[PDB]
Amino acid sequence: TFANVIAVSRGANYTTLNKTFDIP
Amino acid sequence: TFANVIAVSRGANYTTLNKTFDIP
Ligand SMILES: *[C@@H]1O[C@H](CO)[C@@H](O)[C@H](O)[C@H]1NC(C)=O
Numbered sequence: 702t703f704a705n706v707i708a709v710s711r712g713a714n715y716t717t718l719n720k721t722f723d724i725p
Numbered sequence: 726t727f728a729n730v731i732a733v734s735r736g737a738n739y740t741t742l743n744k745t746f747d748i749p
């Protein structure tokens with residue numbers, strides 16, 4: 702959800718979805 | 726002031742002003 706995750710830059714080895722987030 | 730607070734998402738039970746912040 703929004704206000705459950707934080708919007709950041711990348712880091713060491715994040716996991717790619719090859720999608721877009723459902724969070725509006 | 727700007728650079729005195731942090732712009733975030735919500736959290737558990739923040740306080741509503743029903744106004745807008747004076748911070749430009
Ligand atoms: C995501 O897309 C990239 C680019 O095509 C691909 O190399 C990678 O394997 C994909 N990863 C997953 C988990 O689908």
Ligand SMILES: *[C@@H]1O[C@H](CO)[C@@H](O)[C@H](O)[C@H]1NC(C)=O
Nearest residue numbers: 738739740741742743744745
């Ligand atoms: C803020 O506005 C909401 C929506 O009208 C209202 O339910 C709430 O009581 C108000 N809170 C304060 C502190 O004015």
